[PDB]
């Protein structure tokens, strides 16, 4: 009875990260990536848009960037294979801060993993225009 889909569309969105609080920005991207307003509106597959993030380096964090925001990422058999880095220390990887906050708010299964292909983060402004030969429909946060 209920309506199902097609796929002829693949919308590309261009969100700017500039001064947006991390989780606040993250939410918008994760929802537009899953199927917020959803084309045919279905969960057995990916109806989601291809978010392209720009200005990753200029993203905002509240009271603590130096303290508290610590990315624990513990390696092979933990023979003290316990690695931790401050969010300020992610001057090395600005793209992985947004990336590994958005994936955090996505389903985690076979499909969920397939969804991280859609997010495409860049720290620049004019230089991210790499994956910018398809659509470039800019959508602001709030």
């Amino acid at each position: 009875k209920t309506y199902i889909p097609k796929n002829d569309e693949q919308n590309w969105v261009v969100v700017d990260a500039s001064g947006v609080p991390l989780g606040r920005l993250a939410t918008l991207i994760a929802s537009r990536i899953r199927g917020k307003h959803r084309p045919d509106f279905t969960p057995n597959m990916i109806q989601g848009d291809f978010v392209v993030v720009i200005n990753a380096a200029q993203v905002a964090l509240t009271g603590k960037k130096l303290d508290d925001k610590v990315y624990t990422r513990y390696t092979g058999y933990q023979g003290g294979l316990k690695t931790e880095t401050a969010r300020e220390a992610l001057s090395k990887h600005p793209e992985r801060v947004i990336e590994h906050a958005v994936f955090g708010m996505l389903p985690k299964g076979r499909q969920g993993r397939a969804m991280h292909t859609r997010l495409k983060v860049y720290a620049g402004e004019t230089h991210p225009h790499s994956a910018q030969k398809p659509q470039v429909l800019k959508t602001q946060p709030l």
Binding site: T2, Y3, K36, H37, R38, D40, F41, P43
Partner: protein
């Protein structure tokens, strides 16, 4: 699934499921409930009319 499709379209026309449904409830006349998701998905012209009616019965 039904509810998800509703607030998707409700938000397309600057609303949301919570609000939209209350409008249709406040416009006692409107008692779709079942079917309502298919309208959002297939008939966008029609869905808009119901959004506009829901906005009235409220504010």
């Amino acid at each position: 699934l039904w509810i998800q499709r509703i607030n998707a379209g409700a938000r397309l026309h600057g609303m949301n499921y919570s609000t939209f449904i209350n409008g249709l409830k406040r416009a006692n006349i409107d008692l779709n409930r079942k079917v309502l998701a298919d309208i959002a998905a297939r008939e966008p012209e029609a869905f808009k009319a119901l959004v506009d009616a829901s906005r009235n019965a409220r504010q």
